[PDB]
Amino acid sequence: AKRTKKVGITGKYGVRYGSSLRRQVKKLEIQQHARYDCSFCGKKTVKRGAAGIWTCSCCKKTVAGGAYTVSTAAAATVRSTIRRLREMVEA
Amino acid sequence: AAQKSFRIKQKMAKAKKQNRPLPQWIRLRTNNTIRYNAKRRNWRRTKMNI
Amino acid sequence: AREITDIKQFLELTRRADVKTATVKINKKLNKAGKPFRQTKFKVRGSSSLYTLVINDAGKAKKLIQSLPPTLKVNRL
Amino acid sequence: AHAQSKREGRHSGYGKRKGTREARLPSQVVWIRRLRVLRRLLAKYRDAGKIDKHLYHVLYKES
Amino acid sequence: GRVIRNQRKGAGSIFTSHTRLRQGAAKLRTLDYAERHGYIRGIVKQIVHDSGRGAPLAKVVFRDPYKYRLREEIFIANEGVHTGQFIYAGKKASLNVGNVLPLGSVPEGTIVSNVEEKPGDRGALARASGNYVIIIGHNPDENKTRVRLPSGAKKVISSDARGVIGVIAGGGRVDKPLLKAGRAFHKYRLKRNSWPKTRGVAMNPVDHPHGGGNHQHIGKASTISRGAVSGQKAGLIAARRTGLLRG
Amino acid sequence: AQRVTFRRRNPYNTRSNKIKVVKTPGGILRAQHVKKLATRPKCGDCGSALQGISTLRPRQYATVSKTHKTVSRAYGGSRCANCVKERIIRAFLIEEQKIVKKVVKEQTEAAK
RNA sequence: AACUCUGGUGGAGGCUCGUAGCGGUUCUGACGUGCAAAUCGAUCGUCGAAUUUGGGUAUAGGGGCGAAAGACUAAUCGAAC
RNA sequence: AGCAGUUGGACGUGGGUUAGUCGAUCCUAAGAGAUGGGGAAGCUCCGUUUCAAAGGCCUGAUUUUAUGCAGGCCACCAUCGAAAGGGAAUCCGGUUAAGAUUCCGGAACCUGGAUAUGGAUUCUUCACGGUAACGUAACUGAAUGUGGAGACGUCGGCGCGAGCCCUGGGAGGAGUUAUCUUUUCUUCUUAACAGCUUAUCACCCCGGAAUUGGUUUAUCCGGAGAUGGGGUCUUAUGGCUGGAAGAGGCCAGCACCUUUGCUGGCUCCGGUGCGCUUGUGACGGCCCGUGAAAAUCCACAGGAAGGAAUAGUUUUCAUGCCAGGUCGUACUGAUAACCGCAGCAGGUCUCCAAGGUGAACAGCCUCUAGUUGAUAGAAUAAUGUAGAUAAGGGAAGUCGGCAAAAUAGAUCCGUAACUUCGGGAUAAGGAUUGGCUCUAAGGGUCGGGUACGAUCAACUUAGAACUGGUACGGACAAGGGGAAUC
Ligand SMILES: [Mg+2]
Ligand SMILES: [Mg+2]
Ligand SMILES: [Mg+2]
Ligand SMILES: [Mg+2]
Ligand SMILES: [Mg+2]
Ligand SMILES: [Mg+2]
Ligand SMILES: [Mg+2]
Ligand SMILES: [Mg+2]
Ligand SMILES: [Mg+2]
Ligand SMILES: [Mg+2]
Ligand SMILES: [Mg+2]
Ligand SMILES: [Mg+2]
Ligand SMILES: [Mg+2]
Ligand SMILES: [Mg+2]
Ligand SMILES: [Mg+2]
Ligand SMILES: [Mg+2]
Ligand SMILES: [Mg+2]
Ligand SMILES: [Mg+2]
């Protein structure tokens, strides 16, 4: 069933810590515990391995990433910027 | 301590061989003044402090 | 302790120039379906291991206990 | 004698209980017994041919 | 009358780092002929977790140019590098994420990390997690490169100082609340003994400049001179302004 | 129940002081000091435990014969038959792509 | 239609009740020329972690160390012996 | 020895501690610390690889050799630091007044060294089989490099094993026997080491999957090759055998200052499980925590070098031969062997851990083992200290419900305000509970034509009748609650 209405993963914290703080940690404990898809084998088997490490259980390949997501928005912007500058330099 | 060093066991051996009373013939000597063993040690009275 | 399942290997083992003593141990055992019989263990004392040959037939036991070398000291029981 | 009485079912009423139901026998243990019974029966039936794999796979998840 | 707690940290008795579990000093490869004239290919073999550090470390194995062996370097992993990735380090390296190439041989607006202050000191700037240095300038007549540091500071580095393309991995770490002193305890247990912090106003006057009184107050001004001496500097040292950052 | 004692002067439940209660031919329960369990040799590429090689404590490999410590294939007790297969396939294919790259580069530098 | 609901499963938490353990609330109980230069009894707080602890090691006196009481630094602490 | 004492941890005199395998020794941890060098009037301080001319390993295996009058290689740079961490290897039985993993007997193993025989390999000189995972008794391999082991958190449930517990049959011995009881208690054991077998996981070969299938307690896996059919492996672990019944155990009969023993029998076959303790396996959860190091040992890559007659070399195969030093080793580990002035209700780290009740390593009772020690006797005044009870009232007592009492386990019902929506909550509040005789559900293994039965077993749940001085969480154990304020 629906065990909890809105705390979700932060029902382990009970009534403590403050509701805003438990919301802020809920939105990142979902993110750091989600299974992500691998960019090398296509399977949704990427898990976090001590923040910054994201390891795929198939094919055993490990990517550096953000502390709670595989790809932060700053890093994706950096990847696009370096792609743009490399395409400008080598052409 | 049942796992001693030889230095501790050497001092323990000296203490064992010293843990004796006065010889009785020493009290019969000419101009004897020694009455008893005044450096006598027991394990229940004074710890020898290694 | 090692067990031999071979007769010729045992017999060349008794003449190894390190073996001085053997033992013939007689067990009063039971087979399957419980009939009493006479197991015989021949134990050769090598210099590193003791080798046991287990013979469940008294005819073969009598044959090998006579085929043992005469210079080798055999204990019984 | 008390063990034979307990096997016959005596000395197990409401006032002979000091631990909870889940303390006396866990609901997880009861569930594990049930699920292994149903999976054993389903695998026995599928390998005996009295159900096919397409009925077995429905009944596996429904069990 | 007593030596105070910030003064006691320089003797370094209990205030040393807790460096048992750390993988090594995360440094760039040493500046040799290969890195100075061409490039050298290494291989990422592990992305490991450093203890007391918020960012992962890439154990990148190169070949030693002069002796047949393998030289393992410990880089700070930029966000996007993976195991089995070839890392190309040197002047003739290409502009890919993870490559280690000088600030003279990159375009304007390039985003680097683990970037040096002097050419050959093996990584100094933008090494914490999520941090990066933007390359805003070049000055080829004096071999300089204007960069923007993570603090907003504009700095002029040599164009032969190196940097690793990308942002440092482990970004967004501080966005999660620690929620409890247990999480802060285990945070600082592998860094150093800088926690828990007693406030100086809770102390006695012998323990701190702020201590004492029948009410917990500071008494004198918290803004202390830069030319003040060791023992007085317990407050806001050399503060240009105070209060909230509003206008 | 008979109750056993440690046979050595270490009285603590350390990793090197594990015991096992065993019944002796005298009929009594006695502690038996078990050694540490051995770990399988792992591959140097994938880290998976590799087959055909005995699981011994590290100085027990000096006692056994050469057969127990290797497999008869290349990279015997070092790699695990799919890592070796990948190394062979990669060694063949990259050293053919090197020849292809050599003739393409020679063509492009010989055109102009 | 976005999506809701129910029954199971699962076994999280500086979660709870409570042994060992660690503390030491109240009796302002006992004792108070004591068993004891701080204990005894009941009653209590806590009990899976900011836990409890042995061994090794480091910090030494106007110095240390202090989740801060001028606390603790060998029955010695608003400056040990 | 706060009484005593013939007793003693006391007094007097002696005896006692046996190691290749248990430890130290060796390695590194946090760290201590010389050297070079720098500082300091100096005692000495810094630093631990530095800004040092810091060096030792094999020669291709050998007579112009105490192996050099030769190459070749290594770029590291003291040492101390753990009797709980890492670590080469020993077990059973017996034995003493007191020692034992140390002695004795038997059975092993490890390291170092020497070295012979058998085997193997060799006219294709440095093996062969399997498609393969890999197999084997062997089956050359220097520098150098690489890799592995050492080498690693914590919790949760599940699986397997061991020991214990429970228990059936049988072979003994002991108890009870007015009556009953095929009964109550007890013995029925198998070490290190060795051989052959033995597995989750993992891998290989065939094959090519949607009607998606396999599958866990826990939902993961499959065209990057699932299910399925064959195999390969690690040997934790189990089984059979050797050890090894000859030992040990339980008995019987005869000997009866017999030396002090002899002879004989039996020591067998099972079952069970959310059991307990422990080891372990495959997993899962957690982390801004991702949970030592080195010694040491091995393998691989490389191919320097060396070598072929009836076996030239080489043997990580087997069997043989010799050696294993030094120190510790007795005992207590505490209500008397340690610290607290002591023979002090204090403090002091840890392993093992039976039956019942019960959720329980709680409390209460017992088995093995241990103790029965603490000045005693008499009498039963007050006042105490500890434990209780009390008619009617029920906080009127007191600064204050201090102290005590009430409540309490489990099952079912019922549960408010407020809330950060997680809680509050065991809210509050209310029924039931014994015994006996039954009933009904909840399992495992055993078969089919190229619809159903034997058989075995555990304790959970629900219900019913009957029954009793309405008792029943019958001892123990075990929340008082509510409305509010700071
Ligand atoms: Mg239970
Ligand atoms: Mg449940
Ligand atoms: Mg440090
Ligand atoms: Mg503070
Ligand atoms: Mg204060
Ligand atoms: Mg052993
Ligand atoms: Mg808690
Ligand atoms: Mg609690
Ligand atoms: Mg307690
Ligand atoms: Mg304790
Ligand atoms: Mg008082
Ligand atoms: Mg008094
Ligand atoms: Mg007194
Ligand atoms: Mg001072
Ligand atoms: Mg004050
Ligand atoms: Mg004091
Ligand atoms: Mg007296
Ligand atoms: Mg007297």
Ligand SMILES: [Mg+2]
């Ligand atoms: Mg005496």
Ligand SMILES: [Mg+2]
């Ligand atoms: Mg040893």
Ligand SMILES: [Mg+2]
């Ligand atoms: Mg040392």
Ligand SMILES: [Mg+2]
């Ligand atoms: Mg050790």
Ligand SMILES: [Mg+2]
């Ligand atoms: Mg023995």
Ligand SMILES: [Mg+2]
């Ligand atoms: Mg003894």
Ligand SMILES: [Mg+2]
């Ligand atoms: Mg012996």
Ligand SMILES: [Mg+2]
């Ligand atoms: Mg031959």
Ligand SMILES: [Mg+2]
């Ligand atoms: Mg062959």
Ligand SMILES: [Mg+2]
């Ligand atoms: Mg042995």
Ligand SMILES: [Mg+2]
């Ligand atoms: Mg398959």
Ligand SMILES: [Mg+2]
């Ligand atoms: Mg335990």
Ligand SMILES: [Mg+2]
């Ligand atoms: Mg190995």
Ligand SMILES: [Mg+2]
């Ligand atoms: Mg050999």
Ligand SMILES: [Mg+2]
């Ligand atoms: Mg001894």
Ligand SMILES: [Mg+2]
């Ligand atoms: Mg002893």
